[PDB]
Design a protein around this ligand. Structure first.
Ligand SMILES: CC(C)C[C@@H]1CCO[C@@H]2[C@H](CN[C@@H]2C(=O)N[C@H]2[C@H]3O[C@H](OCC/C=C\[C@H]2C)[C@H](O)[C@@H](O)[C@H]3O)C1
Ligand SMILES: [Mg+2]
Ligand SMILES: [Mg+2]
Ligand SMILES: [Mg+2]
Ligand SMILES: [Mg+2]
Ligand SMILES: [Mg+2]
Ligand SMILES: [Mg+2]
Ligand SMILES: [Mg+2]
Ligand SMILES: [Mg+2]
Ligand SMILES: [Mg+2]
Ligand SMILES: [Mg+2]
Ligand SMILES: [Mg+2]
Ligand SMILES: [Mg+2]
Ligand SMILES: [Mg+2]
Ligand SMILES: [Mg+2]
Ligand SMILES: [Mg+2]
Ligand SMILES: [Mg+2]
Ligand SMILES: [Mg+2]
Ligand SMILES: [Mg+2]
Ligand SMILES: [Mg+2]
Ligand SMILES: [Mg+2]
Ligand SMILES: [Mg+2]
Ligand SMILES: [Mg+2]
Ligand SMILES: [Mg+2]
Ligand SMILES: [Mg+2]
Ligand SMILES: [Mg+2]
Ligand SMILES: [Mg+2]
Ligand SMILES: [Mg+2]
Ligand SMILES: [Mg+2]
Ligand SMILES: [Mg+2]
Ligand SMILES: [Mg+2]
Ligand SMILES: [Mg+2]
Ligand SMILES: [Mg+2]
Ligand SMILES: [Mg+2]
Ligand SMILES: [Mg+2]
Ligand SMILES: [Mg+2]
Ligand SMILES: [Mg+2]
Ligand SMILES: [Mg+2]
Ligand SMILES: [Mg+2]
Ligand SMILES: [Mg+2]
Ligand SMILES: [Mg+2]
Ligand SMILES: [Mg+2]
Ligand SMILES: [Mg+2]
Ligand SMILES: [Mg+2]
Ligand SMILES: [Mg+2]
Ligand SMILES: [Mg+2]
Ligand SMILES: [Mg+2]
Ligand SMILES: [Mg+2]
Ligand SMILES: [Mg+2]
Ligand SMILES: [Mg+2]
Ligand SMILES: [Mg+2]
Ligand SMILES: [Mg+2]
Ligand SMILES: [Mg+2]
Ligand SMILES: [Mg+2]
Ligand SMILES: [Mg+2]
Ligand SMILES: [Mg+2]
Ligand SMILES: [Mg+2]
Ligand SMILES: [Mg+2]
Ligand SMILES: [Mg+2]
Ligand SMILES: [Mg+2]
Ligand SMILES: [Mg+2]
Ligand SMILES: [Mg+2]
Ligand SMILES: [Mg+2]
Ligand SMILES: [Mg+2]
Ligand SMILES: [Mg+2]
Ligand SMILES: [Mg+2]
Ligand SMILES: [Mg+2]
Ligand SMILES: [Mg+2]
Ligand SMILES: [Mg+2]
Ligand SMILES: [Mg+2]
Ligand SMILES: [Mg+2]
Ligand SMILES: [Mg+2]
Ligand SMILES: [Mg+2]
Ligand SMILES: [Mg+2]
Ligand SMILES: [Mg+2]
Ligand SMILES: [Mg+2]
Ligand SMILES: [Mg+2]
Ligand SMILES: [Mg+2]
Ligand SMILES: [Mg+2]
Ligand SMILES: [Mg+2]
Ligand SMILES: [Mg+2]
Ligand SMILES: [Mg+2]
Ligand SMILES: [Mg+2]
Ligand SMILES: [Mg+2]
Ligand SMILES: [Mg+2]
Ligand SMILES: [Mg+2]
Ligand SMILES: [Mg+2]
Ligand SMILES: [Mg+2]
Ligand SMILES: [Mg+2]
Ligand SMILES: [Mg+2]
Ligand SMILES: [Mg+2]
Ligand SMILES: [Mg+2]
Ligand SMILES: [Mg+2]
Ligand SMILES: [Mg+2]
Ligand SMILES: [Mg+2]
Ligand SMILES: [Mg+2]
Ligand SMILES: [Mg+2]
Ligand SMILES: [Mg+2]
Ligand SMILES: [Mg+2]
Ligand SMILES: [Mg+2]
Ligand SMILES: [Mg+2]
Ligand SMILES: [Mg+2]
Ligand SMILES: [Mg+2]
Ligand SMILES: [Mg+2]
Ligand SMILES: [Mg+2]
Ligand SMILES: [Mg+2]
Ligand SMILES: [Mg+2]
Ligand SMILES: [Mg+2]
Ligand SMILES: [Mg+2]
Ligand SMILES: [Mg+2]
Ligand SMILES: [Mg+2]
Ligand SMILES: [Mg+2]
Ligand SMILES: [Mg+2]
Ligand SMILES: [Mg+2]
Ligand SMILES: [Mg+2]
Ligand SMILES: [Mg+2]
Ligand SMILES: [Mg+2]
Ligand SMILES: [Mg+2]
Ligand SMILES: [Mg+2]
Ligand SMILES: [Mg+2]
Ligand SMILES: [Mg+2]
Ligand SMILES: [Mg+2]
Ligand SMILES: [Mg+2]
Ligand SMILES: [Mg+2]
Ligand SMILES: [Mg+2]
Ligand SMILES: [Mg+2]
Ligand SMILES: [Mg+2]
Ligand SMILES: [Mg+2]
Ligand SMILES: [Mg+2]
Ligand SMILES: [Mg+2]
Ligand SMILES: [Mg+2]
Ligand SMILES: [Mg+2]
Ligand SMILES: [Mg+2]
Ligand SMILES: [Mg+2]
Ligand SMILES: [Mg+2]
Ligand SMILES: [Mg+2]
Ligand SMILES: [Mg+2]
Ligand SMILES: [Mg+2]
Ligand SMILES: [Mg+2]
Ligand SMILES: [Mg+2]
Ligand SMILES: [Mg+2]
Ligand SMILES: [Mg+2]
Ligand SMILES: [Mg+2]
Ligand SMILES: [Mg+2]
Ligand SMILES: [Mg+2]
Ligand SMILES: [Mg+2]
Ligand SMILES: [Mg+2]
Ligand SMILES: [Mg+2]
Ligand SMILES: [Mg+2]
Ligand SMILES: [Mg+2]
Ligand SMILES: [Mg+2]
Ligand SMILES: [Mg+2]
Ligand SMILES: [Mg+2]
Ligand SMILES: [Mg+2]
Ligand SMILES: [Mg+2]
Ligand SMILES: [Mg+2]
Ligand SMILES: [Mg+2]
Ligand SMILES: [Mg+2]
Ligand SMILES: [Mg+2]
Ligand SMILES: [Mg+2]
Ligand SMILES: [Mg+2]
Ligand SMILES: [Mg+2]
Ligand SMILES: [Mg+2]
Ligand SMILES: [Mg+2]
Ligand SMILES: [Mg+2]
Ligand SMILES: [Mg+2]
Ligand SMILES: [Mg+2]
Ligand SMILES: [Mg+2]
Ligand SMILES: [Mg+2]
Ligand SMILES: [Mg+2]
Ligand SMILES: [Mg+2]
Ligand SMILES: [Mg+2]
Ligand SMILES: [Mg+2]
Ligand SMILES: [Mg+2]
Ligand SMILES: [Mg+2]
Ligand SMILES: [Mg+2]
Ligand SMILES: [Mg+2]
Ligand SMILES: [Mg+2]
Ligand SMILES: [Mg+2]
Ligand SMILES: [Mg+2]
Ligand SMILES: [Mg+2]
Ligand SMILES: [Mg+2]
Ligand SMILES: [Mg+2]
Ligand SMILES: [Mg+2]
Ligand SMILES: [Mg+2]
Ligand SMILES: [Mg+2]
Ligand SMILES: [Mg+2]
Ligand SMILES: [Mg+2]
Ligand SMILES: [Mg+2]
Ligand SMILES: [Mg+2]
Ligand SMILES: [Mg+2]
Ligand SMILES: [Mg+2]
Ligand SMILES: [Mg+2]
Ligand SMILES: [Mg+2]
Ligand SMILES: [Mg+2]
Ligand SMILES: [Mg+2]
Ligand SMILES: [Mg+2]
Ligand SMILES: [Mg+2]
Ligand SMILES: [Mg+2]
Ligand SMILES: [Mg+2]
Ligand SMILES: [Mg+2]
Ligand SMILES: [Mg+2]
Ligand SMILES: [Mg+2]
Ligand SMILES: [Mg+2]
Ligand SMILES: [Mg+2]
Ligand SMILES: [Mg+2]
Ligand SMILES: [Mg+2]
Ligand SMILES: [Mg+2]
Ligand SMILES: [Mg+2]
Ligand SMILES: [Mg+2]
Ligand SMILES: [Mg+2]
Ligand SMILES: [Mg+2]
Ligand SMILES: [Mg+2]
Ligand SMILES: [Mg+2]
Ligand SMILES: [Mg+2]
Ligand SMILES: [Mg+2]
Ligand SMILES: [Mg+2]
Ligand SMILES: [Mg+2]
Ligand SMILES: [Mg+2]
Ligand SMILES: [Mg+2]
Ligand SMILES: [Mg+2]
Ligand SMILES: [Mg+2]
Ligand SMILES: [Mg+2]
Ligand SMILES: [Mg+2]
Ligand SMILES: [Mg+2]
Ligand SMILES: [Mg+2]
Ligand SMILES: [Mg+2]
Ligand SMILES: [Mg+2]
Ligand SMILES: [Mg+2]
Ligand SMILES: [Mg+2]
Ligand SMILES: [Mg+2]
Ligand SMILES: [Mg+2]
Ligand SMILES: [Mg+2]
Ligand SMILES: [Mg+2]
Ligand SMILES: [Mg+2]
Ligand SMILES: [Mg+2]
Ligand SMILES: [Mg+2]
Ligand SMILES: [Mg+2]
Ligand SMILES: [Mg+2]
Ligand SMILES: [Mg+2]
Ligand SMILES: [Mg+2]
Ligand SMILES: [Mg+2]
Ligand SMILES: [Mg+2]
Ligand SMILES: [Mg+2]
Ligand SMILES: [Mg+2]
Ligand SMILES: [Mg+2]
Ligand SMILES: [Mg+2]
Ligand SMILES: [Mg+2]
Ligand SMILES: [Mg+2]
Ligand SMILES: [Mg+2]
Ligand SMILES: [Mg+2]
Ligand SMILES: [Mg+2]
Ligand SMILES: [Mg+2]
Ligand SMILES: [Mg+2]
Ligand SMILES: [Mg+2]
Lengths: 275, 48
RNA sequence: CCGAGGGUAGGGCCCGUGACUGGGGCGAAGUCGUAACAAGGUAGCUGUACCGGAAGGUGCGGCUGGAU
RNA sequence: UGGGAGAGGGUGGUGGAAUUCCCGGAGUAGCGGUGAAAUGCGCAGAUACCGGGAGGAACGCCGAUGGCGAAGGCAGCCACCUGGUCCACCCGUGACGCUGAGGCGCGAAAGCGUGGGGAGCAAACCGGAUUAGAUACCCGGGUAGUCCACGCCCUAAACG
RNA sequence: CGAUGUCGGCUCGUCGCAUCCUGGGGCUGAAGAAGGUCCCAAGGGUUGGGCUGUUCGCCCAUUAAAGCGGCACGCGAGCUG
RNA sequence: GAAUGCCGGCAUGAGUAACGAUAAAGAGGGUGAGAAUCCCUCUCGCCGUAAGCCCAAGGGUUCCUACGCAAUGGUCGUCAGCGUAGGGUUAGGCGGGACCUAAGGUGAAGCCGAAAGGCGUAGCCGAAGGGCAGCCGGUUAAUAUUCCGGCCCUUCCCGCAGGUGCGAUGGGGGGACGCUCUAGGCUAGGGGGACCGGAGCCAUGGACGAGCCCGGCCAGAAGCGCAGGGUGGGAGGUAGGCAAAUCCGCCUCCCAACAAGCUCUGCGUGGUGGGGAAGCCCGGGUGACAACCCCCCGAAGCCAGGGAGCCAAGAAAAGCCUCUAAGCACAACCUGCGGGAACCCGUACCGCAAACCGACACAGGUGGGCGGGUGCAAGAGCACUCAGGCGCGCGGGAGAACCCUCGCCAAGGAACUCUGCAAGUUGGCCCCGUAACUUCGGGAGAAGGGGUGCUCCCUGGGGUGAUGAGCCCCGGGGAGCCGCAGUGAACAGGCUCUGGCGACUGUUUACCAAAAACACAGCUCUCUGCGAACUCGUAAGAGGAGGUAUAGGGAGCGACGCUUGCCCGGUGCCGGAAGGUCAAGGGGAGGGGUGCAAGCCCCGAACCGAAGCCCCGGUGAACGGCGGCCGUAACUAUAACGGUCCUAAGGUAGCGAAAUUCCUUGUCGGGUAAGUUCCGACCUGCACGAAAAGCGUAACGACCGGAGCGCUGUCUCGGCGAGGGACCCGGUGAAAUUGAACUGGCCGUGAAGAUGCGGCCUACCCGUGGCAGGACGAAAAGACCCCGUGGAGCUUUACUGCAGCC
RNA sequence: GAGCUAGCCCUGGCCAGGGUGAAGCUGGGGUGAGACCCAGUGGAGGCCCGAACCGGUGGGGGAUGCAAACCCCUCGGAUGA
């Protein structure tokens, strides 16, 4: 339930913030954090390779467990739910009966105090993980691995899920967050339920400084630049695009498909996204 | 106003110093030319 | 001290008037179509929505104050 | 107190018919459509037929001159939460009643906001016919919307 | 063209006369008053404002009159810009 | 003899400008060959959130002392940051290193690249971050947390004693963290004292006083006290913390829980050791057995790793503690005590500046800490002042124009002008009071007013203390006094109305543009299923992202409101297993050269044969585009209506002479005496129009218009006055420019604008202060304009390639 | 060559004083319960005023400068992009 503000500055008019009700613990687990090395968008050459980055709040990385087949059979208790600033989803502190502690991204509906477990035999309950083949068709599911033992890749951000559609041999058919239909191998693990913090999408940044806090530097339009800079640059006065609209590097940017033609995963894409 | 020379002993030694010059094919050609020319100083002296 | 009133400043209601503009009434024999009254030639009406020179048309839902 | 009928209301679940789209197969010269046609679709293999899948929306028969609700309105089936109401007994209170300016709530459809959803249908719009014209009626397309959540709107031939 | 700074204003003038006013005249379709028209005349004078960057022009209030032109469309080693 | 030639020298301009902040000087005495300028004293002025003091950087002897004055110093010079010489910098505890890690850098392993080289986990390096033991005073011409004095402390080695499973680069804990707000208690620092100590003072009318003036502390081990921080104890289980583990984590039981205890800090005290003024006397000496006490204010600092709230969610590693493994348990570690040991580098001085960056002893620039008092509501603001530091390295006169900075001005009040440009006005605080419109916050300090000093009296509340006194902080009422005036000086909004643009705060052309431009939340299209797309790179490898469609890239639009129409023929992109075209390659009909021949060698048709293109569809918040003529109504006029040509389709709503309207100052209305601007309308829109968004929009703006009030030297229209210059005298002394010059006016002439030619006119020789008409004055080989088969940036359906992609 | 400047990364530091008074919370009222209203508390914010600090709006001065961008007056931000 995104929170509003009264219009008592110009920017508070529209600013909305997450409510943080599901948060039960406000400092991270010291053994699970490491320094998140800000890049500025620069690569090992020093060159900006992603424009308009840098200047965000300092953050610590929270090691997330994206395997969970690491501890088949060992239940854990949901000790806490925590803010993670490296991701839209919330995160769940888990105390294994092992004594081991681990973070998972927090699915919707998950309650502090409950138990989750992982494995071929685990119950179909929000928060459990099983290879995809053992999850009933129609189950909504998140943190899906894409190839077995490679790590959860799909449906991780706030609010997202994949739905299990059907089986075909060693592969199940998932409807991804994007709407694509994809064969994903059945030994790939997945966690029951949808990722939580679904209200994330309705947050209204409200002011320019807010994007600054997130490390987003102002984006300059190509139409605002000169010809030395950009297809759209130049012109006396304002100017329409005057050519198929383009990126700074000259490639068309309205419609032009860019997935590689002869990519081996094509055999496993059943139907591209829609909408 | 703030001018362009803002001396800094560490900066000087790390940028133009003997060891920087030797680390690199170009800096080595610098040392070699200033030797062939007979420069009394191959590199800027800083106090360090 | 209070004090008719004069002055300064700012509000409230009303009246008159105003380039231009909105529709309304009225007006023996103007121009356009024919929406309604018969099943009025697409039953009519209807709240709403959108569109169209105009009456109107269409969508959704409602009424019979509809025919056979 | 004991009983009853009922699409009264809300939440969750879930079942079959049908349409569309997709995949497989089989098959070929048309299908569709109309007052008649054209546009449209089709040898790049359509229509018609079989199997598989996906998805939304509505619930046939029962069904009625029926039932329930204060109205608006309510129809597959199931469970749960819940309102109204009638009958019997003649047991309890002892006029505690009627109405009700204001107030508060409810209030078809359309419409509006924010998310979602989108099969069929369809304002707008496009095209084909008709016509003197045809910003219509008829035909082929078609976007809001029609669906769900929350929040607004508060109108009506909201009629007996 | 190894630079003759360009519109308007301001300031400071100075000159021409094809004279706007003031002085002197002839003709008048000059009764008077007031005009018209031409001649002589450059001594002096020739206002303040609204609009516009404006020169110009229009307008307001006046005036005896609110003249027209030259001086590198006078004047930026004088100002403005 | 010329090349705006080159190098050097030397002229001219000229005894001219200038001598570098308008904080400011005067005199006496000394020294010396020489003194405005050096030293000393007295007077005067200036800074005092500095123009004082302490760190860091940077500088590198500039520090102190003697002797000097050629040059340097904008003058002088006896002086100096100058010349010569001698001296001067002292650490286990300060800072850095023999400690740690951050970005980054480097890099065993490993990866990549024609060479050179590029990467790269560990590890190593890397600090103003972490970690770590010294405070106060005295001493020198010059260093001092360094020497010395007093009182404290750290580590290393070795020994003694007690204790214990000792033991690590491995496990674990801790270290360890944000922003805003902030509690208690202290300290720094400050104010006051009628108390305590002091040399003295009584003036000029008065005061011998509860007088004036000065001062009234600093450091300190253990112990103690106050205030804080940190921390549950026990037991059983145990599969996790990449071996082990008694540690840690997880489950359970019991006891403890706003505590306590233990522990660690800060503050107070504390054996002891220091300091100690005014004044007077010659840095010293006295004062002085100096006194060293009470009250108040009180941090942003300390206790600290404190508390609360919030979202944008806030380093690492070591030191340290605990666990155990090899081992070893004659060892080893822990605690106590004792003796011994303890290295390298810096330390001078300048440090908002004459020593640093600016060529200069340059009005500029330079990070951190301290920065006293009083009053003004507060404060680091302002004025004045303490400590401390200065008067800015040319002076002396004069009292013209003119210029600068400043003050005032009769009557008028924007008439000034492109424009109220500039300058007035206003101006703090308390109180009263405040409109349209609004997104309900705002608009708002709206507007507009009133109050404001001092004195006496009465009185309310808080803090400290004790509930009182005293001191301190917020008030309340009554009566008075003075002046032209009570934020009496200084610091301190002019206001309103109404348009255009842009929502807003932000950003920008360093050095002519700050804006309407850029950005911005927000909206839409589109690409991207992750070894993502995309970007940088030959590559490896990186970024994207230790992210995963509620996410990431690209593009346009630009809060919000109401909206965003018609065209898919062309270009783009998207879809399309047919068809057409299509390269290498396949195929090899059929020819050819040569050889006696086997053969060797070459040309080669049909046909099969990608992407691309053609072709068929889709698609606008993709590139884009959204008609012409003629007729028509019972007054005229105009055309709801019609006809016809053309289109891919003919511009919808909304707006409109506009940041767009050419004709144009369109026309009408408003405002004005008067209005090319402005505002409101009209619509024949030269040439608006819907995300190169259309129309609106509260708030906002050093944006650009228009008006009004207030007030003014803007002006009619100028006048006076101040200071700094200009001027004169002494000192020091440039510059661009310069063919040479013995360099007048007119009218002509002349390459067409003549000091220089002709004719006339005028004119004794040489300066000084002034003004700028001329010397087509200076400056700059015109930046406009053209020319050169000159250059460069940029574009594209110019050509031709290349990367990249297929 | 990034000791100037532009961006980013790491690690530190700095922002006198005053003003306005969001959410929440407490209580009161309210109702079937509610929404909600009132008061107090509270202390938010690319909030307001204004030094330091960062700027560079208008004018004036300077223009062989104090200065190859300075000086005076005025003006913008000043808890934040
Ligand atoms: C239609 C017009 C374009 C006619 C045009 C007007 C322009 O100039 C004039 C040209 C004719 N020549 C004039 C000229 O070059 N003048 C220059 C001046 O430059 C410096 O003065 C300030 C710059 C102003 C002008 C520049 C160009 C310099 O100091 C002066 O000596 C002088 O060189 C004509
Ligand atoms: Mg809000
Ligand atoms: Mg509100
Ligand atoms: Mg949450
Ligand atoms: Mg860690
Ligand atoms: Mg990284
Ligand atoms: Mg690197
Ligand atoms: Mg970079
Ligand atoms: Mg990029
Ligand atoms: Mg970037
Ligand atoms: Mg993310
Ligand atoms: Mg989160
Ligand atoms: Mg798979
Ligand atoms: Mg969003
Ligand atoms: Mg962030
Ligand atoms: Mg954005
Ligand atoms: Mg942008
Ligand atoms: Mg541009
Ligand atoms: Mg540009
Ligand atoms: Mg470039
Ligand atoms: Mg280019
Ligand atoms: Mg280009
Ligand atoms: Mg362009
Ligand atoms: Mg442009
Ligand atoms: Mg243009
Ligand atoms: Mg442009
Ligand atoms: Mg174009
Ligand atoms: Mg393009
Ligand atoms: Mg897809
Ligand atoms: Mg600079
Ligand atoms: Mg520097
Ligand atoms: Mg250094
Ligand atoms: Mg350094
Ligand atoms: Mg450096
Ligand atoms: Mg380097
Ligand atoms: Mg070096
Ligand atoms: Mg080499
Ligand atoms: Mg070599
Ligand atoms: Mg030598
Ligand atoms: Mg060198
Ligand atoms: Mg009177
Ligand atoms: Mg009809
Ligand atoms: Mg009819
Ligand atoms: Mg009909
Ligand atoms: Mg009909
Ligand atoms: Mg229609
Ligand atoms: Mg066909
Ligand atoms: Mg075929
Ligand atoms: Mg579907
Ligand atoms: Mg009874
Ligand atoms: Mg309703
Ligand atoms: Mg509805
Ligand atoms: Mg048609
Ligand atoms: Mg016909
Ligand atoms: Mg639809
Ligand atoms: Mg009915
Ligand atoms: Mg020329
Ligand atoms: Mg010349
Ligand atoms: Mg010229
Ligand atoms: Mg010249
Ligand atoms: Mg004038
Ligand atoms: Mg005359
Ligand atoms: Mg005259
Ligand atoms: Mg004029
Ligand atoms: Mg002219
Ligand atoms: Mg004109
Ligand atoms: Mg007359
Ligand atoms: Mg003239
Ligand atoms: Mg002319
Ligand atoms: Mg002319
Ligand atoms: Mg001229
Ligand atoms: Mg003239
Ligand atoms: Mg001129
Ligand atoms: Mg000039
Ligand atoms: Mg001029
Ligand atoms: Mg000149
Ligand atoms: Mg001149
Ligand atoms: Mg001249
Ligand atoms: Mg010659
Ligand atoms: Mg020369
Ligand atoms: Mg030459
Ligand atoms: Mg030369
Ligand atoms: Mg010589
Ligand atoms: Mg020379
Ligand atoms: Mg010489
Ligand atoms: Mg000379
Ligand atoms: Mg001379
Ligand atoms: Mg002289
Ligand atoms: Mg001279
Ligand atoms: Mg000079
Ligand atoms: Mg000078
Ligand atoms: Mg000064
Ligand atoms: Mg001055
Ligand atoms: Mg003197
Ligand atoms: Mg002297
Ligand atoms: Mg002398
Ligand atoms: Mg002096
Ligand atoms: Mg002296
Ligand atoms: Mg004296
Ligand atoms: Mg002071
Ligand atoms: Mg030096
Ligand atoms: Mg000398
Ligand atoms: Mg000298
Ligand atoms: Mg000098
Ligand atoms: Mg001497
Ligand atoms: Mg020394
Ligand atoms: Mg020592
Ligand atoms: Mg050693
Ligand atoms: Mg290290
Ligand atoms: Mg290093
Ligand atoms: Mg190191
Ligand atoms: Mg360090
Ligand atoms: Mg130390
Ligand atoms: Mg100590
Ligand atoms: Mg022990
Ligand atoms: Mg921590
Ligand atoms: Mg941490
Ligand atoms: Mg830290
Ligand atoms: Mg924060
Ligand atoms: Mg406190
Ligand atoms: Mg103390
Ligand atoms: Mg005080
Ligand atoms: Mg164990
Ligand atoms: Mg003594
Ligand atoms: Mg502080
Ligand atoms: Mg602390
Ligand atoms: Mg690290
Ligand atoms: Mg052993
Ligand atoms: Mg042994
Ligand atoms: Mg050593
Ligand atoms: Mg020292
Ligand atoms: Mg400075
Ligand atoms: Mg400083
Ligand atoms: Mg100095
Ligand atoms: Mg000086
Ligand atoms: Mg200086
Ligand atoms: Mg003091
Ligand atoms: Mg004050
Ligand atoms: Mg002086
Ligand atoms: Mg000074
Ligand atoms: Mg001086
Ligand atoms: Mg004089
Ligand atoms: Mg005065
Ligand atoms: Mg006076
Ligand atoms: Mg006056
Ligand atoms: Mg006035
Ligand atoms: Mg007046
Ligand atoms: Mg005016
Ligand atoms: Mg102007
Ligand atoms: Mg004031
Ligand atoms: Mg008003
Ligand atoms: Mg109001
Ligand atoms: Mg108003
Ligand atoms: Mg308004
Ligand atoms: Mg309001
Ligand atoms: Mg006021
Ligand atoms: Mg007020
Ligand atoms: Mg009073
Ligand atoms: Mg007084
Ligand atoms: Mg103010
Ligand atoms: Mg703006
Ligand atoms: Mg702008
Ligand atoms: Mg706008
Ligand atoms: Mg806006
Ligand atoms: Mg700001
Ligand atoms: Mg600029
Ligand atoms: Mg420029
Ligand atoms: Mg420049
Ligand atoms: Mg400027
Ligand atoms: Mg500009
Ligand atoms: Mg600005
Ligand atoms: Mg810009
Ligand atoms: Mg904006
Ligand atoms: Mg938007
Ligand atoms: Mg969207
Ligand atoms: Mg590349
Ligand atoms: Mg290569
Ligand atoms: Mg990464
Ligand atoms: Mg993006
Ligand atoms: Mg905006
Ligand atoms: Mg923009
Ligand atoms: Mg509105
Ligand atoms: Mg098209
Ligand atoms: Mg098409
Ligand atoms: Mg197309
Ligand atoms: Mg092909
Ligand atoms: Mg075009
Ligand atoms: Mg076109
Ligand atoms: Mg007729
Ligand atoms: Mg429309
Ligand atoms: Mg118009
Ligand atoms: Mg307009
Ligand atoms: Mg236009
Ligand atoms: Mg016009
Ligand atoms: Mg015009
Ligand atoms: Mg006009
Ligand atoms: Mg008028
Ligand atoms: Mg017109
Ligand atoms: Mg466009
Ligand atoms: Mg445009
Ligand atoms: Mg507008
Ligand atoms: Mg506006
Ligand atoms: Mg507005
Ligand atoms: Mg602004
Ligand atoms: Mg502005
Ligand atoms: Mg104006
Ligand atoms: Mg004057
Ligand atoms: Mg004077
Ligand atoms: Mg004389
Ligand atoms: Mg002399
Ligand atoms: Mg000299
Ligand atoms: Mg000669
Ligand atoms: Mg001569
Ligand atoms: Mg002469
Ligand atoms: Mg002469
Ligand atoms: Mg001629
Ligand atoms: Mg001549
Ligand atoms: Mg002559
Ligand atoms: Mg001659
Ligand atoms: Mg001659
Ligand atoms: Mg001759
Ligand atoms: Mg002659
Ligand atoms: Mg002659
Ligand atoms: Mg003459
Ligand atoms: Mg003279
Ligand atoms: Mg002179
Ligand atoms: Mg002259
Ligand atoms: Mg001249
Ligand atoms: Mg010449
Ligand atoms: Mg000249
Ligand atoms: Mg020049
Ligand atoms: Mg040249
Ligand atoms: Mg030339
Ligand atoms: Mg030139
Ligand atoms: Mg140029
Ligand atoms: Mg030319
Ligand atoms: Mg050519
Ligand atoms: Mg040629
Ligand atoms: Mg060329
Ligand atoms: Mg080129
Ligand atoms: Mg190549
Ligand atoms: Mg590409
Ligand atoms: Mg601040
Ligand atoms: Mg206030
Ligand atoms: Mg309050
Ligand atoms: Mg609270
Ligand atoms: Mg602010
Ligand atoms: Mg204020
Ligand atoms: Mg600046
Ligand atoms: Mg000014
Ligand atoms: Mg200059
Ligand atoms: Mg300045
Ligand atoms: Mg100032
Ligand atoms: Mg401010
Ligand atoms: Mg502030």
């Amino acid at each position: 339930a995104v929170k509003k503000f009264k219009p008592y500055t110009p920017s508070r008019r529209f600013m909305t913030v997450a409510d943080f009700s599901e948060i039960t613990k406000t400092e991270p687990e010291k053994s699970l954090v490491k320094p998140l090395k800000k890049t500025g968008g620069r690569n090992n050459q020093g060159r900006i390779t992603v424009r308009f980055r840098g200047g965000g709040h300092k953050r610590l990385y929270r090691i997330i467990d994206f395997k969970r087949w690491d501890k088949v059979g060992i239940p854990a208790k949901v000790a806490a739910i925590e803010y993670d600033p490296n991701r839209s989803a919330r995160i769940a502190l888990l105390h294994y009966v092992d004594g081991e502690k681990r973070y998972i991204i927090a699915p919707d509906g998950l309650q502090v105090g409950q138990q989750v477990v992982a494995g071929p035999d685990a119950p179909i309950q929000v928060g459990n993980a099983l290879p995809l083949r053992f999850i009933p068709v129609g189950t909504v599911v998140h943190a899906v691995e894409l190839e077995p033992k490679k790590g959860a890749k799909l449906a991780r951000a706030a609010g997202t899920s994949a739905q299990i559609q059907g089986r075909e041999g060693d592969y199940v058919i998932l409807r991804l967050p994007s709407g694509e239909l994809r064969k994903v191998h059945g030994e790939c693990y997945a966690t029951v339920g949808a990722v939580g913090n679904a209200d994330h999408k309705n947050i209204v940044l409200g002011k320019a400084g807010r994007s600054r806090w997130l490390g987003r530097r102002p984006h300059v339009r190509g139409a605002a630049m000169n010809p030395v800079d950009h297809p759209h640059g130049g012109g006396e006065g304002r100017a329409p695009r005057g050519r198929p609209p383009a990126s700074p590097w000259g490639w068309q940017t309205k419609g032009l498909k860019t997935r590689k033609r002869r990519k081996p995963s094509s055999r496993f894409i059943i139907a591209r996204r829609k909408k | 106003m703030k001018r362009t020379w803002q001396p800094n002993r560490r900066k000087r030694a790390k940028t133009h110093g003997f060891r920087a010059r030797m680390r690199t094919p170009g800096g080595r050609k610098v040392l070699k030319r200033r030797r062939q020319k007979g420069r009394w100083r191959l590199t800027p002296a800083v106090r360090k």
